[PDB]
Write an enzyme that holds these catalytic residues in place. Structure first.
Site, PDB file in Angstrom:
ATOM      1  N   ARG A 112      30.636  50.400  45.733  1.00 10.95           N
ATOM      2  CA  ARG A 112      31.440  50.981  44.640  1.00 10.95           C
ATOM      3  C   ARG A 112      30.564  51.855  43.771  1.00 10.95           C
ATOM      4  O   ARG A 112      29.331  51.645  43.743  1.00 10.95           O
ATOM      5  CB  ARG A 112      32.001  49.850  43.759  1.00 10.95           C
ATOM      6  CG  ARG A 112      33.160  49.083  44.397  1.00 10.95           C
ATOM      7  CD  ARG A 112      33.738  47.995  43.455  1.00 10.95           C
ATOM      8  NE  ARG A 112      34.274  48.517  42.174  1.00 10.95           N
ATOM      9  CZ  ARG A 112      34.798  47.732  41.231  1.00 10.95           C
ATOM     10  NH1 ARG A 112      34.835  46.405  41.433  1.00 10.95           N
ATOM     11  NH2 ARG A 112      35.295  48.249  40.113  1.00 10.95           N
ATOM     12  N   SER A 128      47.307  45.960  20.796  1.00 10.77           N
ATOM     13  CA  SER A 128      47.985  44.947  21.618  1.00 10.77           C
ATOM     14  C   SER A 128      48.039  43.544  20.992  1.00 10.77           C
ATOM     15  O   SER A 128      48.966  42.771  21.284  1.00 10.77           O
ATOM     16  CB  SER A 128      47.351  44.863  22.999  1.00 10.77           C
ATOM     17  OG  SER A 128      47.612  46.064  23.702  1.00 10.77           O
ATOM     18  N   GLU A 145      43.609  39.990  31.837  1.00  8.27           N
ATOM     19  CA  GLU A 145      44.042  41.381  31.726  1.00  8.27           C
ATOM     20  C   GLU A 145      44.816  41.819  32.953  1.00  8.27           C
ATOM     21  O   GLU A 145      45.812  42.521  32.837  1.00  8.27           O
ATOM     22  CB  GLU A 145      42.876  42.327  31.537  1.00  8.27           C
ATOM     23  CG  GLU A 145      43.299  43.814  31.563  1.00  8.27           C
ATOM     24  CD  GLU A 145      44.304  44.226  30.436  1.00  8.27           C
ATOM     25  OE1 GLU A 145      44.529  43.483  29.441  1.00  8.27           O
ATOM     26  OE2 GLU A 145      44.855  45.343  30.534  1.00  8.27           O
ATOM     27  N   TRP A 151      34.115  50.438  33.871  1.00  5.96           N
ATOM     28  CA  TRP A 151      35.059  50.088  32.788  1.00  5.96           C
ATOM     29  C   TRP A 151      34.677  48.689  32.280  1.00  5.96           C
ATOM     30  O   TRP A 151      35.095  48.260  31.181  1.00  5.96           O
ATOM     31  CB  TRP A 151      36.531  50.161  33.260  1.00  5.96           C
ATOM     32  CG  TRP A 151      36.986  48.975  34.084  1.00  5.96           C
ATOM     33  CD1 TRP A 151      36.665  48.685  35.385  1.00  5.96           C
ATOM     34  CD2 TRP A 151      37.866  47.928  33.645  1.00  5.96           C
ATOM     35  NE1 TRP A 151      37.261  47.492  35.770  1.00  5.96           N
ATOM     36  CE2 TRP A 151      38.024  47.029  34.724  1.00  5.96           C
ATOM     37  CE3 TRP A 151      38.551  47.680  32.444  1.00  5.96           C
ATOM     38  CZ2 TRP A 151      38.833  45.883  34.636  1.00  5.96           C
ATOM     39  CZ3 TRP A 151      39.348  46.542  32.349  1.00  5.96           C
ATOM     40  CH2 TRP A 151      39.484  45.654  33.446  1.00  5.96           C
TER      41      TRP A 151
HETATM   42  C1  HEA Z   1      47.415  44.153  38.825  1.00  4.02           C
HETATM   43  C2  HEA Z   1      46.152  43.906  39.160  1.00  4.02           C
HETATM   44  C3  HEA Z   1      45.680  42.729  39.946  1.00  4.02           C
HETATM   45  C4  HEA Z   1      46.340  41.573  40.477  1.00  4.02           C
HETATM   46  C5  HEA Z   1      47.784  41.101  40.501  1.00  4.02           C
HETATM   47  C6  HEA Z   1      45.244  40.776  41.123  1.00  4.02           C
HETATM   48  C7  HEA Z   1      45.489  39.601  41.813  1.00  4.02           C
HETATM   49  C8  HEA Z   1      44.532  38.834  42.450  1.00  4.02           C
HETATM   50  N1  HEA Z   1      43.175  39.137  42.537  1.00  4.02           N
HETATM   51 FE1  HEA Z   1      42.306  40.799  41.866  1.00  4.02          FE
HETATM   52  N2  HEA Z   1      41.417  42.312  40.985  1.00  4.02           N
HETATM   53  C9  HEA Z   1      41.967  43.353  40.246  1.00  4.02           C
HETATM   54  C10 HEA Z   1      43.313  43.493  39.908  1.00  4.02           C
HETATM   55  C11 HEA Z   1      44.242  42.561  40.303  1.00  4.02           C
HETATM   56  N3  HEA Z   1      44.030  41.393  41.014  1.00  4.02           N
HETATM   57  C12 HEA Z   1      40.923  44.316  39.837  1.00  4.02           C
HETATM   58  C13 HEA Z   1      41.234  45.571  39.021  1.00  4.02           C
HETATM   59  C14 HEA Z   1      39.663  43.837  40.362  1.00  4.02           C
HETATM   60  C15 HEA Z   1      38.278  44.476  40.230  1.00  4.02           C
HETATM   61  C16 HEA Z   1      37.818  44.604  38.782  1.00  4.02           C
HETATM   62  C17 HEA Z   1      36.504  45.366  38.735  1.00  4.02           C
HETATM   63  O1  HEA Z   1      35.472  44.830  39.215  1.00  4.02           O
HETATM   64  O2  HEA Z   1      36.498  46.509  38.225  1.00  4.02           O
HETATM   65  C18 HEA Z   1      40.068  42.588  41.030  1.00  4.02           C
HETATM   66  C19 HEA Z   1      39.094  41.839  41.632  1.00  4.02           C
HETATM   67  C20 HEA Z   1      39.340  40.666  42.263  1.00  4.02           C
HETATM   68  C21 HEA Z   1      38.207  39.957  42.837  1.00  4.02           C
HETATM   69  C22 HEA Z   1      36.736  40.323  42.839  1.00  4.02           C
HETATM   70  C23 HEA Z   1      36.212  40.844  44.143  1.00  4.02           C
HETATM   71  C24 HEA Z   1      34.774  41.199  43.795  1.00  4.02           C
HETATM   72  O3  HEA Z   1      34.541  41.980  42.820  1.00  4.02           O
HETATM   73  O4  HEA Z   1      33.888  40.713  44.527  1.00  4.02           O
HETATM   74  C25 HEA Z   1      38.894  38.821  43.397  1.00  4.02           C
HETATM   75  C26 HEA Z   1      38.357  37.684  44.113  1.00  4.02           C
HETATM   76  O5  HEA Z   1      38.610  36.545  43.716  1.00  4.02           O
HETATM   77  C27 HEA Z   1      40.334  38.924  43.129  1.00  4.02           C
HETATM   78  C28 HEA Z   1      41.256  37.964  43.522  1.00  4.02           C
HETATM   79  C29 HEA Z   1      42.602  38.082  43.231  1.00  4.02           C
HETATM   80  C30 HEA Z   1      43.618  37.083  43.670  1.00  4.02           C
HETATM   81  C31 HEA Z   1      43.342  35.816  44.462  1.00  4.02           C
HETATM   82  C32 HEA Z   1      44.859  37.560  43.167  1.00  4.02           C
HETATM   83  C33 HEA Z   1      46.205  36.907  43.265  1.00  4.02           C
HETATM   84  O6  HEA Z   1      46.792  36.914  41.942  1.00  4.02           O
HETATM   85  C34 HEA Z   1      47.135  37.507  44.347  1.00  4.02           C
HETATM   86  C35 HEA Z   1      48.245  36.466  44.623  1.00  4.02           C
HETATM   87  C36 HEA Z   1      49.288  37.068  45.531  1.00  4.02           C
HETATM   88  C37 HEA Z   1      49.446  36.799  46.840  1.00  4.02           C
HETATM   89  C38 HEA Z   1      48.562  35.839  47.574  1.00  4.02           C
HETATM   90  C39 HEA Z   1      50.524  37.525  47.627  1.00  4.02           C
HETATM   91  C40 HEA Z   1      51.891  36.838  47.551  1.00  4.02           C
HETATM   92  C41 HEA Z   1      51.955  35.436  48.068  1.00  4.02           C
HETATM   93  C42 HEA Z   1      52.650  35.038  49.176  1.00  4.02           C
HETATM   94  C43 HEA Z   1      53.472  35.992  50.020  1.00  4.02           C
HETATM   95  C44 HEA Z   1      52.617  33.564  49.526  1.00  4.02           C
HETATM   96  C45 HEA Z   1      51.805  33.242  50.780  1.00  4.02           C
HETATM   97  C46 HEA Z   1      50.353  33.637  50.597  1.00  4.02           C
HETATM   98  C47 HEA Z   1      49.322  32.813  50.869  1.00  4.02           C
HETATM   99  C48 HEA Z   1      49.530  31.420  51.375  1.00  4.02           C
HETATM  100  C49 HEA Z   1      47.910  33.296  50.651  1.00  4.02           C
HETATM  101  N4  HEA Z   1      40.557  40.065  42.447  1.00  4.02           N
END
Ligand code: HEA
Ligand SMILES: CCCCC/C=C\C/C=C\C/C=C\C/C=C\CCCC(=O)O[C@H](COC(=O)CCCCCCCCCCCCCCCCC)COP(=O)(O)OCCN
Ligand SMILES: CCCCCC/C=C/CCCCCCCCCC(=O)O[C@H](COC(=O)CCCCCCCCCCCCCCC)COP(=O)(O)OC[C@@H](O)CO
Ligand SMILES: CCCCCC/C=C\CCCCCCCCCC(=O)O[C@H](COC(=O)CCCCCCCCCCCCCCC)COP(=O)(O)OC[C@@H](O)CO
Ligand SMILES: CCCCCCCCCCO[C@@H]1OC(CO)C(O[C@H]2O[C@H](CO)[C@@H](O)[C@H](O)[C@@H]2O)[C@@H](O)[C@H]1O
Ligand SMILES: C[C@H](CCC(=O)O)[C@H]1CC[C@H]2[C@@H]3[C@H](O)C[C@@H]4C[C@H](O)CC[C@]4(C)[C@H]3C[C@H](O)[C@]12C
Ligand code: CUA
Ligand SMILES: [Cu+2]
Ligand SMILES: [Mg+2]
Ligand SMILES: [Zn+2]
EC number: 7.1.1.9
Lengths: 227, 49, 57, 144, 75, 84, 71, 513, 104, 43, 46, 93, 259
Positions: H437, H156, H241, H125
């Site tokens: 993947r 959008s 996004e 995608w």
């Molecule tokens: C709704 C969708 C969504 C959301 C909310 C997030 C949220 C986050 N994402 Fe994610 N992410 C994706 C969808 C999402 N992501 C998708 C689709 C991909 C792959 C895309 C692709 O390659 O096709 C991806 C990929 C992705 C990668 C790439 C991995 C790789 O390809 O090698 C990484 C790494 O940095 C990452 C990090 C994060 C982090 C740090 C958050 C943060 O926002 C999360 C924060 C939340 C918390 C931490 C939990 C709550 C917190 C607490 C309870 C407090 C205490 C916690 C601590 C002290 C840690 N995401």
């Protein structure tokens, strides 16, 4: 390689991979702890008939649940970043090997001395020898000297690929027009497997990587014999 | 007046559970699925060369 | 030129129940019909073309 | 008794533990004896009988606390039905295994596996903890 | 000579310019010698370094373009 | 740009205060952490009496005329080299 | 006659009691974890390499016939 | 009929159109997901080589993100609820609103066209070149995909302009921004992210289009271009996004949790607003955590690790504030509440594995493996989806005037909960042990976790089918709503169920004091 | 402010001679949102307000919510009823238990 | 929420019919395609 | 004006539950079916 | 010259709003009303063109929570949160 | 009967014809690029023009003729236009990003220099500088136009707006001639790519902005604008300034610094 029902990382073959295992244990402990705290607090909030439904002051508990997390992140970043900068330090390789990704196979070039290069293709399943691994074996393996620092250079001659060997903790994208560097050092002889790690078309699933690590003297004779 | 759950709760639970266990135990063991469990402790290694 | 805005206001505020896009009179109806016919006709055409393109040639 | 949809902008009756005195009485229209009862209520409550006291309670409120808070057997239906549908999912998987899934690769045959296993052990796959670490190379058996 | 040494001008993961630079250097040096008609072997280090680092298809393609008159670098 | 923020409904003290404590001071706190980190003196470089540095065309109007106004013995060599 | 019980802040009191409980349980799990997982792992790797002989390891592999490059 | 449904300028009706479209897209996306797991549920080749497989993978993602989640959350719940929650008579641009809707079915049609012509777009995608270029993907498929994204982007961007304007300009005069419910905040923040991020995506896929058709070379090294440049431009949009996908969900969760805790307000309202804005801002400066293996310098990698982790702080404030909202509640165990509580825990798990991935040193090993697939399905297929199901069961009676069967909705929750966890939990194991993947087949060692993951997906299928029957039952039985609690703090319900076509023709009265 | 001052405000609230029906509901519905079971003297004043409003039903409801607010602390309600006994007797207020209204 | 009793009650039997029809509508077309996969593919 | 009220604020009729069943079946069913037929289309193509 | 003014050319609602503002009136609710003391003798007077209108009460300055309810023609009603009094003064425009 | 100041718009077919036109144009470009036909495309361009024509006609009916634009409504339209312009700025940003990425690290294929070997840029002191003065000048004349309008001066409004438009036209003709004269093309690697695509989209916006100015011209001719209420004109002026500013960035980046 991975074995059936594996839960965690492949055993480390390089000192950096072992470093990553311990950093992951450290981080996973935090992950399990926070998620179980959250599940627990949830069950707590939900298991009493006592009520308190009037406005509540947030002007202090926000300090806690903002500073605590800040501290945790730091406890993660510190070792995370020590390792990052470790894997960046100057090292002086004894040997440079190039690999070029192609649809769908790898080619390898050892051109420090002679012009040695060859293609490395998956063994098709109908041709596996007894005891060989489906999708993982190649006709020509990447023979390398063990216990030595090797500079790997990675590129591609067509689409993206990515060159990975999990037990050495290696993954370097193969991009046309670019020459990406990583270092490789195995602590042990043996056979170490990886797979193409960037979608690249019809046979993305079927262009694996096999390193064969042996004593320098065997590597030299092998090199000479491949000219 | 007993509601649907007082009337049928017990039977729904008992038969739901019994059926679920039966069909999953059957799917898992009787139709040739390859689970590929670990050979550790179960496979006798055999000469390959 | 002269300011004929008032006459336009009179026309477009006439209490005849018509939507704004048709309130100008019969010309609106024709332009609407031309537009809608081109969009609907072109859309069916795009589907024919998808049907065509969906197979080798 | 009868609640109506055209009454939505008006204060309504609710039984809620946390809102014990709702905005309106449960019953607003009163029969002749109910009217006499409300008059009797203006005098000493000691002169009210038990039945009268209950009736006054039931005009003001629909369900008592004990009634509105009671637990139910709903959980049995939810868990049982969930298991039933999860059981039905296994039927789908059986059908798929039977009509869709061809034979799996020959590399899962028992003999291939025994041979692949020895080769994995000869190349010392995962020798620190993962795999070969669980083989006893001295006794030529799996560590007991 | 075992392989190309670390070079502090190109310390990062992208080593593309390292390969390019040394390729340029060797053929520039070669021209300077060959010109002022002298000893090309003084250029050997650059040739070793770029043969080590540079993909065979890159070198081969650049050689072909130098011969063709279409190499875009300055030599 | 728009940032990622949002508000704007109405310009007031409250919004600017919200930005002061919710964005501005937290940014300063982070940058403070980042500095209170990369701090720690550095391996001062070997002295080389380059002629384009440690300029002296006229004595400074203070001290012995040869020390810069915020001279730091540890990192600022004189024209003849470091002190001790 | 019944004694007067505590009647106030019952929710806050349950809350405090259990939060402190969750804290204690967390240090007990950390202790347990960096003993049965982290230390265990550090010790497997240390034990494995303490007297590891890579040439001997290689020699066994070569004799079992695994290598393309060494018979 | 045509006047009402094709020429709409009404916020409720357009919301309803978005809900129907997203529900239909949901069935498409589900079918694609089952095709994936059907291929993965036994070693060997089921469908064909990687091309058809990744055409399915690619379409699964595009449909779930662009045609299911965004329309449902923003077009559907956003249009229905935002004007009602601020006492407004409609959206600022009611007719432009209708075009945002009607751009979507052509967009979806273009995506279907792509998969039907030639050999489809098997690109991921993310549509990376050169795989997506005119040599490795010759013919019309990738261009159909680019155009589909262009239409969805325009939809959008105009929607976002409509939402920001509406929310800034159409509140009662006494209502400051700090008196609008958290859902309205979440939709406005989301709209600002769309406004800023989509046009960067538009520039980048436009450059891909011209590389494929006009002999430009933005991404082609032969002309001096760089495939990595596409990645930067894509991810500059792509990370925002994902916050766009979860933020309206955070808004709903806040309303659901408050509501079924019997509370008049969420704990720490201003911390909640702060958290959403912070997450929105931080979401624009972390994109290269999607590029840790491309060969970036180490300091750049240290910065992207640290900046990414920092998002845990504001996010943790929200999670703890949801818990504090529950604290002391008169807890109502409605199906919606169950979706919300599942949300809180499962989102948290997925957020934490995101924190693992943020560590670029570990990401070297985790990148392009199933560990990443597990991360994101926890936040999307549990997070986004649970928020959606929660909102849907909660507001269904507002939108329709009828009630669902609560027992059936609880059963549906239980099935889904089992299914999604069975699907995605084992993928952590597959990732750590190195399964890549976008593979149609895997080395035999990975068989067990894949078989169980595939069985999971079938359980989720059963839940999906049950949901459809449940919605049918509601409409078939016609239990009309009479009374709804807590209307004093939930304005959207105060006009009855379903509200009249025109609401707030006479606006609310609110004093300044 | 101390516990005693809290209690005193509430005793005073319900003790207003001409308290109306709205104010009685507002008072009890606000009070039960707090993290506490109201002191007997507070309940006493609200019961006396029910009397001045000629509302027997609400007096009984008030006793039910006292019991409800105690949650699993089963010793609270019997104590409060014990303390209210003279007022119950004086006013002819029957308990939810005496009326069979504690039955599921 | 409170609601009125159903205006058009759906009995256990009618629900069984609705549920069965719903499931078949998802399962049959897909089953048919998958079942004939051999004939589409494994041609 | 337009019809208002339950069952009237939607583009589909809920007047008859069996006709509604048929409509919802074709609606959700066509969506679920489409990827199966596109796969088949592609396979029957080469 | 040659350019029309709003006085001369503004029409429909825009004109109504312009004229009403001239007279210090607010029939289109552009402005926020000011609270009276809210007692039963001095209730907030809430204009309406029917016999009910929704009121939102910001009980205290800076509350983020708004309290919403239908105000009906008749006796003054009280906010269910802070008790301040409101009274409908129906009909016209 | 409403007692708010906001506009409830009559049911309209233009959102749908607009959407269908988007489908026809995108499907049309596909057919053009891959099936050697322009038919779908021409239909799509046609329905798109008809849609914009009738939609904006209607907005004029609603405001000038029917009085629906109260201050509150106008205030929204102001926000709407600001946001739209922000989204356009972000759109250009993606192209400036591309330009700086390629020019700041020129790859070996280019000769490892910028401009690439074999590229001869235009002289920034020649027609590009003239273009620059033309657009800056039109920003002065449109400001005179705006003040004339607010001061109720119909004639000077029309003459300043005419000059503004003529300048836009001139810029467009200059650019078209420069495109014809340029010895490099869109297919000349990343240099031609960034140059033509970035300045080409800019040129498209100049055409769009000039068209908008021309719409304002004829509306002014017909006395639509009052000295105080003239949002269409303000919006066209904001857009026009946006177009001028983007030019300044292109001139400084691509023509001057990138030469
Ligand atoms: C709704 C969708 C969504 C959301 C909310 C997030 C949220 C986050 N994402 Fe994610 N992410 C994706 C969808 C999402 N992501 C998708 C689709 C991909 C792959 C895309 C692709 O390659 O096709 C991806 C990929 C992705 C990668 C790439 C991995 C790789 O390809 O090698 C990484 C790494 O940095 C990452 C990090 C994060 C982090 C740090 C958050 C943060 O926002 C999360 C924060 C939340 C918390 C931490 C939990 C709550 C917190 C607490 C309870 C407090 C205490 C916690 C601590 C002290 C840690 N995401
Ligand atoms: C003086 C100002 C001129 C304005 C533009 C004039 C003509 C093109 C029409 C519109 C331009 C719009 C966008 C720009 C798109 C492509 C490049 C256009 C710039 C241009 O006009 O470049 C010309 C080539 O254009 C070419 O390929 C011609 C390509 C013709 C087809 C246009 C491409 C259609 C694809 C655009 C996709 C649109 C995506 C937009 C989505 C936005 C958000 C959804 C330069 O000519 P050359 O001979 O190579 O060199 C000159 C040597 N003497
Ligand atoms: C080849 C020749 C043609 C080329 C075709 C290319 C397209 C060109 C389109 C040019 C844009 C024309 C815009 C016309 C709008 C006229 C309607 C209008 O201007 O409407 C005004 C409101 O503003 C409003 O809607 C403002 C409406 C916003 C206008 C938006 C303009 C930008 C459109 C962008 C489209 C380009 C796509 C971008 C490419 C990436 C009406 O209110 P007032 O003016 O206050 O009048 C009221 C007074 O009379 C009362 O006293
Ligand atoms: C690759 C090819 C892709 C093709 C995609 C193109 C698709 C469709 C193009 C044809 C559609 C345009 C038809 C005219 C649209 C005019 C919209 C408009 O002008 O909307 C206005 C609001 O937006 C405002 O102001 C400010 C916002 C105005 C935006 C103008 C609309 C054109 C935008 C298209 C370009 C997308 C943006 C690109 C950003 C990177 C008016 O709002 P309404 O709700 O109507 O009325 C409200 C009443 O009170 C008016 O009296
Ligand atoms: C990934 C989602 C899929 C979930 C799994 C679906 C499981 C249940 C599907 C049932 O579908 C039917 O199954 C058949 C057999 O059981 C079919 O009959 C086929 O076989 C019959 C007898 O074997 C023949 O008589 C028929 O012609 C026919 O083609 C086939 O048509 C199909 O409709
Ligand atoms: C016709 C009109 C005077 C009568 C009126 O005001 O309606 C005048 C006033 C301003 C004139 C315009 C302005 O002077 C600007 C242009 C000047 C050019 O020399 C002719 C066209 C041009 C566009 C003129 C056409 C026409 O004569 C206008 C429009
Ligand atoms: Cu090569 Cu994937
Ligand atoms: Cu990201
Ligand atoms: Mg990758
Ligand atoms: Zn109030």
């Amino acid at each position: 390689m991975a074995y059936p029902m594996q839960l965690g990382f492949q055993d480390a073959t390089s000192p950096i991979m072992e470093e990553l295992l311990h950093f992951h244990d450290h981080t996973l402990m935090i992950v399990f702890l926070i998620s179980s705290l959250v599940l627990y607090i949830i069950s707590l909030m939900l298991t009493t008939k006592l009520t308190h439904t009037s406005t509540m002051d947030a002007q202090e508990v926000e300090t806690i649940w903002t500073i605590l997390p800040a501290i945790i992140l730091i406890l993660i970043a510190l070792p995370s970043l020590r390792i990052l900068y470790m894997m960046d330090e100057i090292n002086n390789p004894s040997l440079t090997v190039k690999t070029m990704g192609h649809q769908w196979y790898w080619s390898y070039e050892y051109t420090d001395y002679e012009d040695l290069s060859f293609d490395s293709y998956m063994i098709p399943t109908s041709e596996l020898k007894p005891g060989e691994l489906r999708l993982l074996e190649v006709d020509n393996r990447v023979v390398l000297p063990m216990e030595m620092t090797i500079r790997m250079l990675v590129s591609s001659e067509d689409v993206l690929h990515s060159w990975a060997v999990p037990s050495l903790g290696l993954k370097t994208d193969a991009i046309p027009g670019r020459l990406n560097q990583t270092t490789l050092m195995s602590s042990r002889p043996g056979l170490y497997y990886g797979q193409c790690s960037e979608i690249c078309g019809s046979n993305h699933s079927f262009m694996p990587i096999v390193l064969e690590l042996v004593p320098l003297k065997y590597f030299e004779k092998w090199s000479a014999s491949m000219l | 007046a007993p509601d649907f759950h007082d009337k049928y709760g017990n039977a729904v639970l008992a038969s739901g559970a019994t059926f679920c266990v039966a069909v999953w135990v059957y799917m898992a063991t009787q139709i040739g699925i390859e689970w590929n469990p670990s050979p550790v402790g179960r496979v006798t290694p055999k000469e390959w060369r | 030129f002269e300011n004929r805005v008032a006459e336009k206001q009179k026309l477009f505020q006439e209490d005849n129940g018509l939507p704004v896009h048709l309130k100008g009179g019969a010309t609106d109806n024709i332009l609407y019909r031309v537009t809608m016919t081109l969009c609907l006709g072109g859309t069916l055409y795009s589907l024919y073309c998808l049907g065509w393109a969906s197979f080798p040639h | 008794s009868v609640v109506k949809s055209e009454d939505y902008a008006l204060p309504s009756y609710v039984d809620r533990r946390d809102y014990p005195l709702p905005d309106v009485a449960h019953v607003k229209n009163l029969s002749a004896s109910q009217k006499a009862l409300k008059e009797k209520e203006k005098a000493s409550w000691s002169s009210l009988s038990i039945d009268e006291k209950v009736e006054l309670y039931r005009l003001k409120f629909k369900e008592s606390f004990a009634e509105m808070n009671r637990s139910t057997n709903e959980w049995k239906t939810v868990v049982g039905a969930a298991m039933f549908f999860i059981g039905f999912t296994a039927l789908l998987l059986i059908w798929e295994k039977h009509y869709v899934y061809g034979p799996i690769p020959h590399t899962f045959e028992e003999e291939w596996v025994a041979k692949q296993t020895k080769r994995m052990l000869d190349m010392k796959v995962a020798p620190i903890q993962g795999f070969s670490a669980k083989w006893d190379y001295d006794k030529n058996e799996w560590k007991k | 000579y075992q392989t190309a040494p670390f070079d502090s001008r190109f310390p990062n993961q992208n080593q593309t310019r390292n390969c390019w630079q040394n390729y340029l250097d060797f053929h520039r040096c070669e021209k300077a010698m060959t010109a002022k008609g002298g000893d090309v072997s003084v250029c050997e280090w650059y040739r070793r370094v770029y043969k080590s680092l540079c993909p065979i298809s890159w070198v081969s393609t650049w050689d072909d373009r130098r011969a063709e008159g279409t190499f875009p670098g300055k030599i | 740009a728009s940032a990622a923020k949002g508000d704007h409904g109405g310009t007031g003290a409250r919004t600017w205060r919200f930005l002061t404590f919710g964005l501005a001071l937290p940014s300063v706190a982070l940058c403070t952490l980042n500095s209170w980190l990369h701090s720690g003196h550095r391996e001062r470089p070997a002295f080389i009496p380059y002629h384009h540095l440690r300029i002296r065309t006229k004595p400074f109007s203070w001290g012995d005329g040869n020390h810069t106004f915020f001279h730091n013995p540890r990192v600022n060599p004189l024209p003849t080299g470091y002190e001790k | 006659a019944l004694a007067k019980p505590q009647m106030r802040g019952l929710l806050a009191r349950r809350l405090r009691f259990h939060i402190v409980g969750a804290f204690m349980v967390s240090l007990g799990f950390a202790t347990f974890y960096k003993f049965a997982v982290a230390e265990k792992r550090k010790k497997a790797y240390a034990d494995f390499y303490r007297n590891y002989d890579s040439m001997k390891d290689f020699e066994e592999m070569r004799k079992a016939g695994i290598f393309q490059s060494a018979k | 009929f045509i006047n009402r449904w094709l020429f709409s300028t009404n916020h409720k009706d357009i919301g309803t159109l978005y809900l129907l479209f997203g529900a239909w897209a949901g069935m498409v996306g589900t079918a694609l997901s089952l095709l994936i797991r059907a291929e993965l549920g036994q070693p060997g080749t089921l469908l064909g080589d990687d091309q058809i497989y990744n055409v399915v993978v690619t379409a699964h993602a595009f449909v779930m993100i662009f045609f299911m989640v965004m329309p449902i959350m923003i077009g559907g719940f956003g249009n229905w609820l935002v004007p009602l929650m601020i006492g407004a008579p409609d959206m600022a641009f009611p007719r432009m609103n209708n075009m945002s809707f009607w751009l979507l079915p052509p967009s979806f049609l273009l995506l279907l066209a792509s998969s039907m012509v030639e050999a489809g777009a098997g690109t991921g995608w993310t549509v990376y070149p050169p795989l997506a270029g005119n040599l490795a993907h010759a013919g019309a498929s990738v261009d159909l995909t680019i155009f589909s994204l262009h239409l969805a982007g325009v939809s959008s961007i105009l929607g976002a302009i409509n939402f920001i304007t509406t929310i800034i300009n159409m509140k009662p005069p006494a209502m400051s921004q700090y008196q609008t419910p958290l859902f309205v905040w979440s939709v406005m923040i989301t709209a600002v992210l769309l406004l800023l991020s989509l046009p960067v995506l538009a520039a980048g896929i436009t450059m891909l289009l011209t590389d494929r058709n006009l002999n430009t070379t933005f991404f082609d090294p032969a002309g001096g271009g760089d495939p990595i440049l596409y990645q930067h431009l894509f991810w500059f949009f792509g990370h925002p996004e994902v916050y766009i996908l979860i933020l309206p969900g955070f808004g709903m969760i806040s309303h659901i949790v408050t509501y079924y805790s019997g509370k008049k307000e969420p704990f720490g309202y201003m911390g909640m607003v702060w958290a959403m804005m912070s997450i929105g801002f931080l979401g624009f400066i972390v994109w290269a955590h999607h590029m840790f293996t491309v060969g970036m310098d180490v300091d750049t990698r240290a910065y992207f690790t640290s900046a990414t982790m920092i998002i845990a702080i504001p996010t943790g404030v929200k999670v703890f504030s949801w818990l504090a909202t529950l604290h002391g509640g008169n807890i109502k165990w409605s199906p919606a509440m169950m979706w919300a509580l599942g949300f809180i825990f499962l989102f948290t798990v997925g957020g934490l594995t995101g924190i693992v991935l943020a560590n670029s040193s570990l990401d070297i090993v985790l990148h392009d493996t199933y560990y990443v697939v597990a991360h994101f399905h926890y936040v999307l297929s549990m997070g986004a989806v649970f928020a959606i199901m929660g909102g849907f069961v909660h507001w269904f009676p507002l939108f329709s005037g009828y009630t669902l069967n609560d027992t059936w909705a609880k059963i549906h929750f239980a099935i889904m909960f089992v299914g999604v966890n069975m699907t995605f939990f084992p993928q952590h194991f597959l990732g750590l042990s190195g399964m890549p993947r976008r593979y149609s087949d895997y080395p035999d060692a990975y068989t067990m976790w894949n078989t169980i993951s595939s069985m999971g997906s079938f359980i989720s299928l059963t839940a999906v089918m049950l949901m459809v029957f449940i919605i049918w039952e509601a409409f078939a039985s016609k239990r009309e709503v009479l009374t709804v609690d807590l209307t004093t703090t939930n304005l959207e319900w105060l006009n009855g169920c379903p509200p009249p076509y025109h609401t707030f023709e006479e606006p609310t009265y609110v004093n300044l004091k | 402010e101390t516990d005693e001052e809290f209690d005193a405000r509430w005793v005073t609230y319900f003790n207003k001679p001409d308290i109306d029906a709205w104010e009685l509901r507002k008072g009890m519905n606000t009070l039960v949102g707090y993290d506490l079971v109201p002191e007997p003297k507070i309940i006493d004043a609200a019961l006396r307000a029910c009397r001045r409003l000629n509302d027997f039903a609400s007096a009984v409801r008030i006793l039910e919510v006292v019991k409800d607010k105690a949650g699993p602390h089963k010793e609270i309600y019997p104590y409060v009823i014990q303390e209210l006994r003279p007022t119950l007797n004086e006013l002819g207020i029957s308990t939810p238990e005496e009326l069979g209204l504690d039955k599921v | 929420i409170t609601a009125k009793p159903a205006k058009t009650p759906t009995s256990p039997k009618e629900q069984a019919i609705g549920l069965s029809v719903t499931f078949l509508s998802f399962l049959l077309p897909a089953g048919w395609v998958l079942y004939h996969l051999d004939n589409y593919k494994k041609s | 004006h337009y019809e208002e009220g339950p069952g009237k604020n939607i583009p589909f009729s809920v007047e008859n539950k069996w006709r509604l069943l048929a409509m919802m079946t074709l609606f959700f069913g066509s969506g679920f079916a489409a990827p199966f037929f596109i796969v088949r289309h592609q396979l029957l193509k080469k | 010259g040659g350019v029309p003014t709003d006085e001369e050319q503004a029409t429909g609602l825009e004109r109504e709003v312009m004229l009403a503002a001239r007279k210090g009136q607010d029939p289109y609710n552009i402005l926020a009303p000011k609270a009276t003391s809210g007692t039963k003798e001095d209730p907030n007077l809430v204009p309406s063109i029917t016999n009910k209108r929704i009121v939102g009460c910001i009980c205290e300055e800076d509350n983020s929570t708004v309290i919403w309810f239908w105000l009906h023609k008749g006796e003054a009603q009280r906010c269910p949160s802070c008790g301040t009094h409101y009274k409908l003064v129906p009909h016209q425009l | 009967h409403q007692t708010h100041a906001y506009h409830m718009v009559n049911p309209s077919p233009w959102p749908l014809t607009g959407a269908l036109s988007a489908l026809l144009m995108t499907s049309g470009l596909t057919m053009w690029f891959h099936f050697n036909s322009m038919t779908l495309l021409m239909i799509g361009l046609t329905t798109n023009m008809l849609t914009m024509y009738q939609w904006w006609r209607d907005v004029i009916r609603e405001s000038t003729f029917q009085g629906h634009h109260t201050p509150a409504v106008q205030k929204g339209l102001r926000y709407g236009m600001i946001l739209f312009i922000i989204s356009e700025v972000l759109f250009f940003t993606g192209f400036f990003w591309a330009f700086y990425h390629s020019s700041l690290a020129p790859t070996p294929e280019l000769g490892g220099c910028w401009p690439p070997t074999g590229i001869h840029p235009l002289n920034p002191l020649e027609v590009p500088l003239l273009n620059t003065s033309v657009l800056l000048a039109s920003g002065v004349s449109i400001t005179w136009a705006h003040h004339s309008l607010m001061e109720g001066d119909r004639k000077h409004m029309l003459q300043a707006l005419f000059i503004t438009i003529t300048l836009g036209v001139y810029f467009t003709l200059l650019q078209a001639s420069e495109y014809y004269e340029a010895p490099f093309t869109i297919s000349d690697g990343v240099y031609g790519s960034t140059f033509f695509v970035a300045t080409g989209f800019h040129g498209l916006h100049v055409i769009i902005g000039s068209t908008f100015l021309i719409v304002c011209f004829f509306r002014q001719l017909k006395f639509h604008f009052t000295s105080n209420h003239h949002f269409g004109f303000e919006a066209a002026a904001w857009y026009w300034h946006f177009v001028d500013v983007v030019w300044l960035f292109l001139y400084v980046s691509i023509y001057w610094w990138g030469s």
